[PDB]
């Protein structure tokens, strides 16, 4: 089994299922939960982990609303239905990137093309910068030209820059030569191909790292 | 599922349902609520939240008016009718934005790129920077495509870069198209067409500035 990811905005409210006898956990991929509030006499016990998540146990039977609050400045409400069963794990993905003034200092301290290079090498290798945090990928973030389809995989955001990885599939039988520029949409800032490819044969499986301005447009 | 964004004017009244059994939340993007006022004995508990947020729980069964005052002298009114059900989140927004922040370009360019740019600009202006002093123009500094004739005009040199200006002369009497890449000679750093004209005709006499490397290695 894998944790369930729901991706609510800062205004999001999600009807999930909570357990009764055994404890449950909700954690933020990129933020540390600091407070959690529920109707009085509903949450039996709560504990904060070192990683930054929250372990809570609900002994009540009525459906209730819980608010979770993080350190970077974030608040997500979830509606829990108490059912008898095993504990459940939820991955509360952000969906609207958080504000991180400490990250902006590192982002702006250095040059620009260098910063683009760095953020891209990292996406390629997997060594994500310390300030960057996992955010919901943009469903439609790049121009799709003439027969490609896209699906989203991962996304990392700081303050002024984003980063997305998009799996491209070529529906067209004929192989299509692709140039980075085709993909430009207003608000993107670099398009790089992992496997440097002059052309993509049909049935292609090529991922492309595109970065955008955070909140721009 | 998503916060109910409500842009009401200052002193505005918005009638909205609230839940009498579960906590409700009101937040203003970019503002921190300072105080909340309601008829005495209507809202039992009120709590500040990360950033600007008010989590209130009301056991009342009658419609009542509640005033919220933020940290930038904004006051909004809300008419709340309690109803059995889920807690409701409301994103309070200003009507007409009071001010427009002009965001400065955060982007900074590479040092070498700036050095080339400044010199080219200075030569064009005619002001010659302190380090630079006048010397002899190089006899052949550029590639001459299509019968062009180059006459040395002016030059200045300095510790790490040197500049030469040559006047192009066209003897072709044909419509030519300029591409700065044609004028490349092993050892050139940049080429500037003073008049930004794409095509030169017969007697097209554009003057081009080329910065090479003094102390070339």
């Amino acid at each position: 089994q894998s944790p369930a990811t729901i991706s609510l905005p800062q205004g999001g409210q999600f009807r999930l299922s909570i357990s009764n006898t055994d404890p449950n956990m909700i954690f933020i991929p990129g933020d540390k939960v600091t407070a959690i509030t529920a109707p009085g006499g509903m949450l039996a016990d709560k504990r904060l982990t070192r990683a930054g998540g929250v372990l809570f146990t609900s002994v009540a039977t009525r459906t209730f609303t819980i608010f979770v609050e993080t350190a970077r400045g974030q608040t997500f409400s979830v509606v829990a239905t108490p059912v008898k069963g095993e504990g459940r794990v939820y991955r509360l993905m952000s969906a609207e990137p958080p504000s991180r003034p400490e990250t902006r200092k590192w982002e702006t301290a250095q040059a620009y093309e260098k910063l683009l290079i760095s953020l891209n090498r990292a996406v390629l290798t997997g060594d994500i910068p310390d300030g960057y945090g996992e955010v919901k990928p943009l469903s439609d973030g790049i121009r799709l030209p003439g027969g490609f389809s896209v699906t989203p995989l991962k996304a990392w955001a700081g303050d002024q820059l984003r980063a997305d990885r998009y799996e491209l599939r070529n529906a067209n039988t004929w192989g299509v030569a692709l140039r980075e520029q085709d993909f430009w949409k207003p608000g993107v800032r670099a398009v790089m191909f992992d496997n440097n490819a002059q052309t993509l044969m049909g049935g292609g499986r090529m991922t492309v790292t595109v970065i955008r301005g955070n909140g721009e447009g | 599922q998503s916060p109910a964004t409500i842009s009401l004017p200052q002193g505005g009244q918005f009638r909205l349902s609230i839940s009498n059994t579960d906590p409700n939340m009101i937040f203003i993007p970019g503002d921190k609520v300072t105080a909340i006022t309601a008829p005495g004995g209507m809202l039992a508990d009120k709590r500040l939240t990360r950033a600007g947020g008010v989590l209130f729980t009301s056991v009342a069964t009658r419609t009542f008016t509640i005033f919220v005052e933020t940290a930038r002298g904004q006051t909004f009114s809300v008419v709340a009718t309690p109803v059995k059900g889920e807690g409701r989140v409301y994103r309070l927004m200003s009507a007409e934005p009071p001010s427009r922040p002009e965001t400065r370009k955060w982007e900074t360019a590479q040092a070498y790129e700036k050095l080339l740019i400044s010199l080219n600009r200075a030569v064009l202006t005619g002001d010659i920077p302190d380090g630079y002093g006048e010397v002899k123009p190089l006899s052949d500094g550029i590639r001459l495509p299509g019968g062009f004739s180059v006459t040395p005009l002016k030059a200045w040199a300095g510790d790490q870069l040197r500049a030469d200006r040559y006047e192009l002369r066209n003897a072709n009497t044909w419509g030519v198209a300029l591409r700065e890449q044609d004028f490349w000679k092993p050892g050139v750093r940049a080429v500037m067409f003073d008049n930004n004209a794409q095509t030169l005709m017969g007697g097209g006499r554009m003057t081009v500035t080329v910065i090479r490397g003094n102390g070339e290695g």
Binding site: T34, A35, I36, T37, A38, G40, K46 | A44, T57, V59
Partner: peptide, 11 residues
């Protein structure tokens, strides 16, 4: 405890 909610602020 009427209308009282459980608000635990973690350090």
């Amino acid at each position: 405890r009427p209308g009282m909610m459980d608000s635990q602020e973690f350090s």
